[model samples]
Target: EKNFVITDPRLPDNPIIFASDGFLELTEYSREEILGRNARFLQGPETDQATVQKIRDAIRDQRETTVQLINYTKSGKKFWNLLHLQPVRDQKGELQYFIGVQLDGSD
Candidate 1:
């Protein structure tokens, strides 16, 4: 299953407002646990800052970026995630939301 999450930029802290069923299955986190949390919550002790910075750069510049990094599941299991992140705008060109698709790169 394809995993994804929708986050509202207009909301404080740009929290995750919606998550796909695939995402829940990947992270093993409940819908209630994921909502209102920043996407970086998936990061673990071994996650790299440079990769994290790459995503933050896209957030600040409102551009699409792809990055692969280590992310931890709910049970502290590690997996490689190839993330494609982009800003979703409305017809009026207003920044609406940020959508990120996660691909499991672990083998």
Candidate 2:
């Protein structure tokens, strides 16, 4: 499974951008908390270096990738998230947005 999973049916219109409601709930962050921020806001000093690097690589390549990484909630609680990242392109085949799916793995 992708490191980030979006189960919400409302994503067809939004495609799970940087900080959606689905992401906020799973990460335990307020909607206003990360609205204009990257999902990396969930990452911190304790996050895995290798996993973070892998995500960086995919972003650099503009390719899709699945990774397992640690994310911290607003209260500093940590949980594992399965993140799947994909690049959405326009009809002209230009990069439009970076779509992400986040799934909670705290259990």
Candidate 3:
């Protein structure tokens, strides 16, 4: 997994798990607090329903997908994330986990 290093060095505290960083910056939760949790914690009443549904469909189909999403930081500062999600399978061809690569869309 070292060779597949997943992170953008430019970002502060680049994390291996998407939910980790998402929870930290987006939900005001610490890494240890949300390690086993899902990214949905970052979603609230104002989150886009259509985008959320699309994400659900992509995960269900185990396909690679990219989406532009608006999220809020722990400080309530809104930002855009260019999210690229890919499915990673095990040697037995069993779906293992999804790898999400996120980039700040401030540029």
Candidate 4:
């Protein structure tokens, strides 16, 4: 199943503004609860800081990048998240949002 979310960089902390149904289902998190929150909410104690830095660097530079990181669910279930972040631009070349695509990489 496909899981994705679009976040607004213009907002404080780049909160998630839109999330796919598949994403909510995958994370078992309510849509209302997840919105307006940073995607790092999914990161747990076991998550790798180096991998998280990669994502942060990409977001700061407004570039597309991919990384596999460990993320957790509301119920404390952890899973391997193969994430791809892409910067979306409007026709005017203005930065609009950042789309984060998450794929389950756990075997």
Candidate 5:
């Protein structure tokens, strides 16, 4: 929601902002493990850089983008992530945090 916010991208440590209730079902990680983390933690050796670029580019452009990339689980098992990222901003439409909803990309 627009009311949600995150730290400046300039923060020394980029934070996750918040996690959805289904986070456990999707990433198999508990709230304890996901807090203060970014989606990149799910990235592994084989995750596509180009897909990640699209994500980064969209964030920079303040646009919404859907990307399919390989994101690993806490167990180190790789899986496809169908990510939908949106810009969360103030009433003035200024950028705040990048909030999103993602799924396993299987169905």
Candidate 6:
């Protein structure tokens, strides 16, 4: 099982603004290890640049997208990640944050 992470895009690099404790169960990374990173941390060889590009495109367009790909844990375990990303904006329509939700698709 995994929990989603919330992030703000105003920083030099999009940094996680929040992480649920349940995230630890999936990543095998302590909060200490989780700090200062974005979603790319879980990407491994099984992760495809094409799929990543899809996400990048969505971010650029401020659109929402869902993709299924493999991800890795700190312990080197591999599992399928069904990821959904949605943009968050202020009433002024300024893109400020994004919520990334990942579900275990290992089956």
TM-score of each: 0.95, 0.75, 0.68, 0.95, 0.80, 0.90
Tens-digit per-residue lDDT, 40-92, candidate 1: 99999989899898889889999999889999999999999999997999999
Query: Which lDDT tens digits does candidate 5 get at residues 19-42?
Result: 765766567787778677666787
Candidate 2 clashing pairs, residues 3+ apart or interchain: 3-82, 3-83, 4-82, 4-83, 4-84, 4-101, 4-102, 5-101, 5-102, 5-103
- What lDDT does candidate 5 reach at residue 71? 80
RMSD of each: 1.3, 6.2, 8.0, 1.3, 3.8, 1.8
Query: Per-residue lDDT for 21-69 in model 2, tens only?
Result: 5665667766556554455677876789998998888876879898878
* 82 Cα displacement, candidate 6 (Å): 0.4
Which is the winner by lDDT between candidate 2 and candidate 6? 6
Where model 3 places Cα greater than 4 Å from the true spot, the runs are 1-28
Please give, for residues 2-106, the per-residue lDDT of candidate 3 as tens digits. 111132212333334434444355446566654544555545556678988998889778788988777665567666666777777779977656677656654
Q: Give the lowest summed-lDDT range of ten residues in model 4.
A: 98-107
Candidate 3 clash figure, as a count:
0
Candidate 6 local lDDT, 6-72, one digit each (tens): 8778875788877767777788888777766786888998788898888888877888898988899
Worst 10 residues of 2 by lDDT: 1-10
- Give the Å error, residue 86, model 6: 1.1
Q: What is the C-alpha lDDT of each candidate?
A: 0.92, 0.66, 0.60, 0.92, 0.70, 0.82
Off by over 4 Å in 4: none
Candidate 5, superposed: residue stretches over 4 Å from native: 1-13
Candidate 6 residue spans exceeding 4 A from truth: none
Candidate 6 local Cα displacement, residue 101, angstroms: 0.5
Backbone clashes (count) for model 1: 0
